[PDB]
Structures are given as C-alpha cells and as structure tokens.
Short mmCIF file of C-alpha atoms (C1' of nucleotides) in Angstrom, two decimals:
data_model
loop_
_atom_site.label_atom_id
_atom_site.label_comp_id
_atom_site.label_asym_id
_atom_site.label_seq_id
_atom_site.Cartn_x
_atom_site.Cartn_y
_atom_site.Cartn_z
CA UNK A 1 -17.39 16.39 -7.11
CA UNK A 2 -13.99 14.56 -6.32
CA UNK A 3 -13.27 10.52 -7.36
CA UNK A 4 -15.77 9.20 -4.22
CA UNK A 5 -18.39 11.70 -4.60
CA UNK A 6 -19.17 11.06 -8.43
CA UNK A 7 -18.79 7.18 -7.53
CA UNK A 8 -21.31 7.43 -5.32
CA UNK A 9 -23.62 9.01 -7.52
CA UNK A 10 -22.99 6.32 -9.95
CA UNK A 11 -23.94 3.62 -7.60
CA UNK A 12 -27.06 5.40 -6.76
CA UNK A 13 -28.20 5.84 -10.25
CA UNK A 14 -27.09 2.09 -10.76
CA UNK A 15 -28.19 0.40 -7.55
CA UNK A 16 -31.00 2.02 -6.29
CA UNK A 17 -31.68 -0.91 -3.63
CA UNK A 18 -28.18 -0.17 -2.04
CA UNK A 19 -27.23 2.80 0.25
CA UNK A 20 -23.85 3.62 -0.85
CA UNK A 21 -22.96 6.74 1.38
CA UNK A 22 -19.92 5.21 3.20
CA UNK A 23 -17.96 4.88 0.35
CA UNK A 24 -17.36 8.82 0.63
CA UNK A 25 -15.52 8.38 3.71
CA UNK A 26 -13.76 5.33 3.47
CA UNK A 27 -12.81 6.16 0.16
CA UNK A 28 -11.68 9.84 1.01
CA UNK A 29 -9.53 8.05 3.51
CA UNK A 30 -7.85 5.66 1.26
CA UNK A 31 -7.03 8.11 -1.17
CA UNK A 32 -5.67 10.49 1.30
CA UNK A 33 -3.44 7.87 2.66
CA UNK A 34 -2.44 7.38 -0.85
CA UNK A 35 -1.78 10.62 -2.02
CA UNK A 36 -0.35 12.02 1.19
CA UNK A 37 2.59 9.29 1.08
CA UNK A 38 3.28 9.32 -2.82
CA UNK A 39 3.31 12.56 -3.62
CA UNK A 40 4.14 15.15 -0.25
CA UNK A 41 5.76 12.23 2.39
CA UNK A 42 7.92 9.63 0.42
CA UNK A 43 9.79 11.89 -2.29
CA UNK A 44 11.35 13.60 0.86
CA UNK A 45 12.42 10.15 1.97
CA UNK A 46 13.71 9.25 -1.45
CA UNK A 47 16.61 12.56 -1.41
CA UNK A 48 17.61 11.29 2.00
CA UNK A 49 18.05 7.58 0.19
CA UNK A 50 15.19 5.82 2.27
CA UNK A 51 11.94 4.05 1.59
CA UNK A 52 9.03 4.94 3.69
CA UNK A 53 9.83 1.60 5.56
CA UNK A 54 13.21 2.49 5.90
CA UNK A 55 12.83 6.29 7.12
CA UNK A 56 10.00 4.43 9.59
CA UNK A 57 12.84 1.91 10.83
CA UNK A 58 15.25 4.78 11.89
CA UNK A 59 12.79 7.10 13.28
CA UNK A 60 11.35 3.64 15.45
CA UNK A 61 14.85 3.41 16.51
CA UNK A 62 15.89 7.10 17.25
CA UNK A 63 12.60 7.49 19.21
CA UNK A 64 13.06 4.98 21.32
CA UNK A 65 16.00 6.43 23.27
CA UNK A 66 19.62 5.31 23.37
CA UNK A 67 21.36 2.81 22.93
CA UNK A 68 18.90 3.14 19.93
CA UNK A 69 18.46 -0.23 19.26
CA UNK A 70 15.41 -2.84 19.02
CA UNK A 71 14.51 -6.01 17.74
CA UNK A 72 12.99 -7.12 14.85
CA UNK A 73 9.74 -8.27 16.38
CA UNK A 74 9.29 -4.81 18.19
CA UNK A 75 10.04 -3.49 14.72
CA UNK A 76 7.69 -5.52 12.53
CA UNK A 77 4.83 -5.03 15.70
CA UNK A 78 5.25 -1.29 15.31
CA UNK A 79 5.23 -0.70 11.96
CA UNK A 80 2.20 -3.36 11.31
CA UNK A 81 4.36 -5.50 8.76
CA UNK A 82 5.13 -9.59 8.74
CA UNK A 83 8.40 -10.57 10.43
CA UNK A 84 9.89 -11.32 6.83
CA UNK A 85 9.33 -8.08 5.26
CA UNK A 86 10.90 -6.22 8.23
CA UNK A 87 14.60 -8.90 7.96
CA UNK A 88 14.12 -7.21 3.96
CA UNK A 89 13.62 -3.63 5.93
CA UNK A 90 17.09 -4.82 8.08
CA UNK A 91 18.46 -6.01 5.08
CA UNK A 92 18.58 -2.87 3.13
CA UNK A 93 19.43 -0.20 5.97
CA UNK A 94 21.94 -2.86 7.20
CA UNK A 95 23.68 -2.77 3.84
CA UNK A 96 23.83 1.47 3.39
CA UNK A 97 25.29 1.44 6.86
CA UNK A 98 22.27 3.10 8.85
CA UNK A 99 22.08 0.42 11.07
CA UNK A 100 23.95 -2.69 12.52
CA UNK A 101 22.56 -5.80 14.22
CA UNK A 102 24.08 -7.99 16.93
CA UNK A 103 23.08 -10.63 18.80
CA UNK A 104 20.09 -10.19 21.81
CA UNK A 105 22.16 -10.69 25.20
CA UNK A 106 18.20 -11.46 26.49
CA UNK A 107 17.44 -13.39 23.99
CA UNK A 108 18.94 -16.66 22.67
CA UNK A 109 16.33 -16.19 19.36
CA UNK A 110 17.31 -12.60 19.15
CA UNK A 111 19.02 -10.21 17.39
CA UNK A 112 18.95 -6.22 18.06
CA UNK A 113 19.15 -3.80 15.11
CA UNK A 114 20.85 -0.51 16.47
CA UNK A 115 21.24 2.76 14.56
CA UNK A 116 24.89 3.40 13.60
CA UNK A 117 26.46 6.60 14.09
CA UNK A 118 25.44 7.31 10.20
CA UNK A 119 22.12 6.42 10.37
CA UNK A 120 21.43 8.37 13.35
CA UNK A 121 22.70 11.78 11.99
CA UNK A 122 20.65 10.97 8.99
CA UNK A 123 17.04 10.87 10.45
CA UNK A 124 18.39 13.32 12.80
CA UNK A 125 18.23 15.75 10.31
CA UNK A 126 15.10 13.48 8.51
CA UNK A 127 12.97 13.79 10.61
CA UNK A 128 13.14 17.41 11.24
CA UNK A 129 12.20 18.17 7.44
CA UNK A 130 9.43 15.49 7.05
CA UNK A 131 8.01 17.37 10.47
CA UNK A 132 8.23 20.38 8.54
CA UNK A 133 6.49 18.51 5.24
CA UNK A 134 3.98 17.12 7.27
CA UNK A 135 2.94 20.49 8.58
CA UNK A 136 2.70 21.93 5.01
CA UNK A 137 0.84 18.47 3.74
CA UNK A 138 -1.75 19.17 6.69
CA UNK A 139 -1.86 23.37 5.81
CA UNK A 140 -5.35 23.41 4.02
CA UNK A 141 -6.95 22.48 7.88
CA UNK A 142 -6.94 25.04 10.50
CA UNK A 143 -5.27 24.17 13.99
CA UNK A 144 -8.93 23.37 15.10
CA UNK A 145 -9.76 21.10 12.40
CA UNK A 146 -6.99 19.05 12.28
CA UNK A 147 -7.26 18.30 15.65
CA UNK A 148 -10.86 17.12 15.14
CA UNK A 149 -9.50 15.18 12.22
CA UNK A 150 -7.00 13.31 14.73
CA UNK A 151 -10.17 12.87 17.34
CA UNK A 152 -12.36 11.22 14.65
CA UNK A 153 -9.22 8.84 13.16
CA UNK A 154 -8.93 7.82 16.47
CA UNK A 155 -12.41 7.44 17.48
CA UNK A 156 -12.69 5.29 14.13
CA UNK A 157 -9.50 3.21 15.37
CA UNK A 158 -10.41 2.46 18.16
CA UNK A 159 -13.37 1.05 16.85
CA UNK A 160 -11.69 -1.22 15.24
CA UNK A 161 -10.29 -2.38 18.49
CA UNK B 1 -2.45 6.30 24.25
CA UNK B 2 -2.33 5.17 20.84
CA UNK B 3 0.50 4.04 18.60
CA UNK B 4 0.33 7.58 17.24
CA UNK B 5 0.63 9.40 20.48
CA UNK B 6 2.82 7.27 22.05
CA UNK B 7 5.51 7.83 19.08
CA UNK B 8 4.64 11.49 19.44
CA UNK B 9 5.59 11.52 23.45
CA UNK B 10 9.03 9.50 22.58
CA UNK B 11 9.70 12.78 20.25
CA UNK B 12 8.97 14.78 22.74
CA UNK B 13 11.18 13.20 24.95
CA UNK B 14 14.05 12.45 22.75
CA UNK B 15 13.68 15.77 20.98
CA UNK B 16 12.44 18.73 22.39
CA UNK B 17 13.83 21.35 20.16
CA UNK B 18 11.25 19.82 17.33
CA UNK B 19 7.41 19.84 17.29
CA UNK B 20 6.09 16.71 16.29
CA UNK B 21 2.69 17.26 16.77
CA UNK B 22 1.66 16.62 13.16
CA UNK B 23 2.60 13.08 13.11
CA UNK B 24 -0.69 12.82 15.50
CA UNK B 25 -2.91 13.01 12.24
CA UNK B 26 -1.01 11.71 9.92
CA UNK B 27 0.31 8.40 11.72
CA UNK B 28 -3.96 7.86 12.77
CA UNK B 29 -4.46 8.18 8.65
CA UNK B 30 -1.96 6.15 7.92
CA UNK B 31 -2.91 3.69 10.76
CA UNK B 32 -6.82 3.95 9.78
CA UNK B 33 -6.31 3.06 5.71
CA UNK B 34 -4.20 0.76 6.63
CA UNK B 35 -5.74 -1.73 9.34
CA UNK B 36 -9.15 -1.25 7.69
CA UNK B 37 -8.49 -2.25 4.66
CA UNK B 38 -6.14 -5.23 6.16
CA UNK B 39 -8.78 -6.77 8.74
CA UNK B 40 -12.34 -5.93 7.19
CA UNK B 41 -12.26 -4.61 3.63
CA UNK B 42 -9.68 -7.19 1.74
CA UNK B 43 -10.59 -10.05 3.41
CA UNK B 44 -14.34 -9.48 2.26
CA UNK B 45 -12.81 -8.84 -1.02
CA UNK B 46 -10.42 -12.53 -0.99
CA UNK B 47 -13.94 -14.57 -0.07
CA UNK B 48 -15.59 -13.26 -3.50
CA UNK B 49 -11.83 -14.67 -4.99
CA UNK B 50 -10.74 -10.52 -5.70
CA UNK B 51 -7.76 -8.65 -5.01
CA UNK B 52 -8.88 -5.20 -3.58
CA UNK B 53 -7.91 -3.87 -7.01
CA UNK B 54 -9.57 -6.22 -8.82
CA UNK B 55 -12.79 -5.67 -7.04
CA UNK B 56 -12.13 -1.90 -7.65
CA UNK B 57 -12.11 -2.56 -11.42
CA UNK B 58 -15.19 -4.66 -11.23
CA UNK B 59 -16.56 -2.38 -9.48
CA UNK B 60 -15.66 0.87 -11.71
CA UNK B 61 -17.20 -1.03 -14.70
CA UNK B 62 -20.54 -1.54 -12.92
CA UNK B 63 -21.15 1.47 -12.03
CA UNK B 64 -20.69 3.24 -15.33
CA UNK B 65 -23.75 1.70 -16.49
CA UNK B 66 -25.05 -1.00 -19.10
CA UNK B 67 -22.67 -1.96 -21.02
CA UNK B 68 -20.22 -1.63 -18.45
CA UNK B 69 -16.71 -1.39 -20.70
CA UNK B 70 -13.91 1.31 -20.28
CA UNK B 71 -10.92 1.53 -21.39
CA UNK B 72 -8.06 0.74 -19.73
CA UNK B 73 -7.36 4.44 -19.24
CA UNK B 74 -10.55 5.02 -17.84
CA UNK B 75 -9.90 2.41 -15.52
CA UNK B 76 -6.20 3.30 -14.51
CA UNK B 77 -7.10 7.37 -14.22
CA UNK B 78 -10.21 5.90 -11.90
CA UNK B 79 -8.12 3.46 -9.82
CA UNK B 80 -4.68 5.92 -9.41
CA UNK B 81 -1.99 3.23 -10.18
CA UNK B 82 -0.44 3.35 -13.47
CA UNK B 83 -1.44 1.99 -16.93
CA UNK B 84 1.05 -1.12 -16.53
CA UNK B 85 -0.50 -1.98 -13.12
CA UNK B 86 -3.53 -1.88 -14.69
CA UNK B 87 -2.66 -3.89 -17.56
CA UNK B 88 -1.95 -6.85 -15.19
CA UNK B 89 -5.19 -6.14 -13.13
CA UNK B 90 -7.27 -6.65 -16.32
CA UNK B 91 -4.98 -9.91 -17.25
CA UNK B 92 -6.20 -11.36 -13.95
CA UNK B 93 -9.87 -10.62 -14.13
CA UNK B 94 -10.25 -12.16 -18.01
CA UNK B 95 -8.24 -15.20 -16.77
CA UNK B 96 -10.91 -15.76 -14.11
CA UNK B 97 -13.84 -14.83 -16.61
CA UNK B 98 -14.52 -11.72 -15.24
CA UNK B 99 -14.16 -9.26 -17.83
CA UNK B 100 -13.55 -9.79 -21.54
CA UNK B 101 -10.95 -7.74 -23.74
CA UNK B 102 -12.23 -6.29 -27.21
CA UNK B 103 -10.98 -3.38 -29.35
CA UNK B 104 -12.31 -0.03 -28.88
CA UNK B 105 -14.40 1.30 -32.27
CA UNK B 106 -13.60 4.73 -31.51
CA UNK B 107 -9.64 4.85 -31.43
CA UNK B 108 -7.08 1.94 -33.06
CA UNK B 109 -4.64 2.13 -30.33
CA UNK B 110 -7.59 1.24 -27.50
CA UNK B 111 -9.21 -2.01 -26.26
CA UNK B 112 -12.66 -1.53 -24.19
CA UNK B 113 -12.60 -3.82 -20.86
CA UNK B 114 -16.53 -4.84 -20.45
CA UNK B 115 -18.21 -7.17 -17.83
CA UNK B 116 -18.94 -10.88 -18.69
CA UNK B 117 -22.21 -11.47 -17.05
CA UNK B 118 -20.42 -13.80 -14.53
CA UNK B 119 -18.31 -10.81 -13.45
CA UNK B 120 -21.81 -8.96 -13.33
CA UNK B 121 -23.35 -10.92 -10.89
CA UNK B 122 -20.37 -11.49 -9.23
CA UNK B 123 -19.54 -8.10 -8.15
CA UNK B 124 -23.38 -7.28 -8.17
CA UNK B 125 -23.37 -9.46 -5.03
CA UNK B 126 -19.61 -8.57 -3.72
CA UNK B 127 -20.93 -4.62 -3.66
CA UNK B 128 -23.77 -5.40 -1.21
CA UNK B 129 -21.51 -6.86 1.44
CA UNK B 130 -19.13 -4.69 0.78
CA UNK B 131 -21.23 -1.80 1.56
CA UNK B 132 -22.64 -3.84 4.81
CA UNK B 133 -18.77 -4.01 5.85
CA UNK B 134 -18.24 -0.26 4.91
CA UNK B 135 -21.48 0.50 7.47
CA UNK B 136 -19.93 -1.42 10.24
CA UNK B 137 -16.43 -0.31 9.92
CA UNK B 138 -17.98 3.23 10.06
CA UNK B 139 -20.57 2.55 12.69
CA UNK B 140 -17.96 3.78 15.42
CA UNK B 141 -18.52 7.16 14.33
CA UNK B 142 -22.20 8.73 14.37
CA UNK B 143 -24.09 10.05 11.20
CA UNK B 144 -22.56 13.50 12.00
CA UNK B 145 -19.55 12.26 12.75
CA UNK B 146 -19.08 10.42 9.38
CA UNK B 147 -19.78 13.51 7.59
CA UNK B 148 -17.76 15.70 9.52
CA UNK B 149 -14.67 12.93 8.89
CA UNK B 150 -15.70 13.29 5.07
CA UNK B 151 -15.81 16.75 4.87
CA UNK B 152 -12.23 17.34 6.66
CA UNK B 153 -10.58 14.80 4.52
CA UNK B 154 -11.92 16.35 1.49
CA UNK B 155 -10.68 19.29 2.68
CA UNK B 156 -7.11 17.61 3.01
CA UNK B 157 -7.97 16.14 -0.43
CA UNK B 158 -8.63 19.69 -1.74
CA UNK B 159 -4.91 21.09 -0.16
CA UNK B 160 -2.56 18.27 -2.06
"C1'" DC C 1 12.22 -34.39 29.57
"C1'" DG C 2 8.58 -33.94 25.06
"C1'" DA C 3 5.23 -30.97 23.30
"C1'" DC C 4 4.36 -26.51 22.23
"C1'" DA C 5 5.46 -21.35 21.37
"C1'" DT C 6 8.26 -17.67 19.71
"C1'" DG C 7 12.15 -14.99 17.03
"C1'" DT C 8 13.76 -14.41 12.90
"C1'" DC C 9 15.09 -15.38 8.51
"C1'" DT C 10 14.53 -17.56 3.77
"C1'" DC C 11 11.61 -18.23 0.19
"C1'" DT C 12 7.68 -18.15 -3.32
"C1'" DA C 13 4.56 -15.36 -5.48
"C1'" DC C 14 2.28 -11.24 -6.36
"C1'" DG C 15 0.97 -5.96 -7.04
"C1'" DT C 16 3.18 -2.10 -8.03
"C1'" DC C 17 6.04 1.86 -10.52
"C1'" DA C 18 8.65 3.68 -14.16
"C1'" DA C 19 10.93 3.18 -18.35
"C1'" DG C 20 10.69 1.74 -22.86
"C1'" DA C 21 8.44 0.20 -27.20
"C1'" DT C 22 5.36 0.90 -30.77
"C1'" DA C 23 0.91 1.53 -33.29
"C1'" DA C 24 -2.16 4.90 -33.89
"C1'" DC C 25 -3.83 9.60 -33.05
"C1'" DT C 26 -3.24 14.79 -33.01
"C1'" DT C 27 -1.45 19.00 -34.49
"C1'" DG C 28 -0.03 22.34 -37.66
"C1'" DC D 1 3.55 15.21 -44.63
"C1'" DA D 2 6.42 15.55 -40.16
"C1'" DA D 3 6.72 16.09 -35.47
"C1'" DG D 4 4.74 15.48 -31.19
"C1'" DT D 5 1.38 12.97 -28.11
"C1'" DT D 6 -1.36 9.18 -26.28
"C1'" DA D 7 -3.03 4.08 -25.33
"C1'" DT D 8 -1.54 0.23 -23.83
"C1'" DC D 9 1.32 -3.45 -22.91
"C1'" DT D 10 5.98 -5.54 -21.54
"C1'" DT D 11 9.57 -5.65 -18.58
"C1'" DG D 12 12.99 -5.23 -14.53
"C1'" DA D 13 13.05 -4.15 -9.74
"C1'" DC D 14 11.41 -3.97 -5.31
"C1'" DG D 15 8.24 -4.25 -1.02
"C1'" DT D 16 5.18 -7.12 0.61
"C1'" DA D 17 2.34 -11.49 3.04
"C1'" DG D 18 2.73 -15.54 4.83
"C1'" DA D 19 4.33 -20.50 4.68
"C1'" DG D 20 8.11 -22.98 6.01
"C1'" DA D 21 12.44 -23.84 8.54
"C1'" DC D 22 14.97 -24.06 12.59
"C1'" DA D 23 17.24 -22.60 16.86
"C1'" DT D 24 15.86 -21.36 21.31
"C1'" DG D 25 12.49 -20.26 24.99
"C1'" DT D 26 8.40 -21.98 27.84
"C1'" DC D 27 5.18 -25.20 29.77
"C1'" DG D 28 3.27 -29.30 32.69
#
DNA sequence: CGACATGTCTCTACGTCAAGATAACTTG
DNA sequence: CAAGTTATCTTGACGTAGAGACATGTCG
C-alpha cells in the first residue's frame, strides 16, 4: 500500500459514514507532481543554474519562434503564475544574462523580455537533456500507457474547464 | 489543443531534430495538480480558515485514530516537506487552537501533536466537503476511468 | 473628455528547503 | 563510556499570491 492507499484505509476504519475513494487519485496525482519535479525534473535545472520557473521562462521564449521574445503577461498567462511573481521570474534571468527586456513598440504599458544570445544556447542544450529526463522519469509506463495517462489528464482538465 | 500540446507543436516546429513528445504527460500532470488544487481544493480548504497543509495535518491526526497525536516526524514523513516546514505548520494550528503541543512519554527529544476537540470537529466537518469536492473534481472521469488514472499513476509512483 | 480596464512592477506576508544547533537516543 | 544518529526547532533565503500603485490603453 503506498501514502494514499493506507490513508484511505484509515479514513474508512475512522469514518465509516464517508466514502473516501477519491483521495487515491487525487492524491496519487499530487504526489506525482511533487515527486516528479523535486527529485527527477528540477535537479537537472539546478546544474544548468535555473529554477523550474526560470528553465519554464526560456523554454516559453525559445518555443515561441524568433525574435524570441514575449511579454510578461503572455509569460505569467502561460505559466499560470500572478503578474508579480513572473517581474521576480524577469528579475532573476534578467540579472544572469539569459534574457533582456525592452520596451513594447505595440504597447505603451509594455515591455518584451527576449532571450539573449546566452540564454538561448543555454536551454538550447536544456531542453534537450530534460527531454531526455523526462523520458526516463516516464520509463516505468509502456508507450501505450502513457499515452492513456495523457488522455485521462486531459479528459480530467478539461473538466475543469 | 491544450496548453500541453500546443507547447509540444511549437517544439516541433522550432526543433525538429528533438522529440518532445513526453512533455505531453508531464506538462497535463503538472497542469492537473496544479489548477485543481488552485480553483477547487484550497479554496475549500481557506473557507474552514486552513492552509492546504494545515488541513493535511489535521487531517493525518484524525485519521490515525482516538487519540489522534503524532509526532512531528510522523507528521512530516506523512506530509513530504521537511521537519522545519513542519515545525511552522504545527505553530500555526496551536495558535488557532487546533492542535495542542505536549511531550512524548516514549522518547525525551519528542513532543506528540494531538487534536483539541475544536480541531476535531473542525476537520471532522472540513473532510466531508472535502471529499464532496474530491467527487466532483473527479466526476469528469467515469468509475473506470478513475481507477485506471489511479492505477497508471501508481505505476509512475512505483518507477521514481 | 472622464470613467474604466489593462500591463507591469513594487511590496507585504507566508510556506518552503536546507543548514545548523543541541538534547536525547542508539550502538558497540 | 565515546562516537554516531535522530527529533525537532530556529534561521536565512527564495518563490509565491495578490493588493496596491501608476502609466497607458479603451470605452461611450
């Protein structure tokens, strides 16, 4: 029995009136999450110098196609964090040189954070090796099964929609 | 397409010598802990007055059973964060009332955490609608679905 | 226009990790 | 005993939400 399992048995030999079989899932899920980013995903972000949030920034740049370069809002929409946290996400990548903002020619408001030269050979080469870590994270699921693992995550997401 | 396969066809584009595939599953995990526990399960959590972790906690000690005290290394090795985090969890939930420090009989360095019966009922009642919130979070997903979702993520569990 | 909305940063306040401290426990 | 280990808290550092501030964009 893992960490949810034996939880749920204590709940049902606590609370007989409840029905606590979701907790299995949900909690599997958190813990997963959890797991998956402290131990596998963010200590190979941490040799290439980056926080999770940082590696995300780059690789939400370098995606997106030259001139590589966004703005905060499309940032802090895409990664799912509050405008403030991602001028702190700015802030720090700004100041190791991985990226460089100037002002938004469309946008009075605006300012667009590009990758610099730097910081795009560095999740050039990042993101190749966390594609590689996230194959070896995802190892214990045949090719079948993780696929029905990404059908059911987004089958659940889009019921939270 | 999702924000998960959208960021996977940019790769594609922008990089065709690498497979990105993975990030499919992963960024939907990621995604799925994250906005569920943002939109349904903390805010349920904030109207009882809890933190997520200090529901967790409350939790944990219920469900051991009468008379619902652990240790603080129980606690910690049950919750996953580490034994300062879960020093300051326990601060917050005896300022409230919710739990009560004493030492531990069976070992000098140890203190037991245990339930006041105001943290009792509280998370007595918190547990209900949290597991009404779990069933409707879930209710996308059919019975067989559900277990098939808890079975492959044990299975992921099982890998790490 | 003035009223309202948005982009973005600055700021407070909090949960978290890891390192360190130290009393008490374990081992031999 | 003497050395090593564990329980637990304290502490510095950092990412984070979201309120607030303010310049600039949008609306009738």
């Amino acid at each position: 029995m893992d960490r949810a399992a034996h939880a749920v048995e204590q709940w049902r030999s606590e609370r007989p009136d409840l029905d606590p079989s979701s907790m299995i899932v949900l909690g599997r899920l958190q813990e997963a999450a959890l797991v998956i980013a402290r131990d596998r995903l963010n200590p190979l972000f941490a040799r290439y110098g980056l926080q999770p949030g940082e590696f995300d920034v780059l690789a939400t740049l370098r995606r997106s196609g030259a001139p590589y370069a966004l703005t905060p809002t499309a940032l802090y929409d895409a990664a799912m964090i509050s405008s403030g946290s991602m001028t702190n996400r700015i802030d720090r990548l700004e100041k190791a040189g991985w990226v460089e903002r100037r002002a938004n020619p469309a946008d009075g408001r605006g300012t667009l954070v590009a990758l610099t030269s730097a910081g795009r050979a560095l999740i050039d080469d990042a993101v190749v090796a966390h594609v590689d870590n996230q194959r070896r994270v995802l190892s214990a699921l045949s090719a079948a099964e993780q696929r029905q693992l990404a059908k059911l995550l987004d089958k659940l997401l889009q019921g939270q929609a």
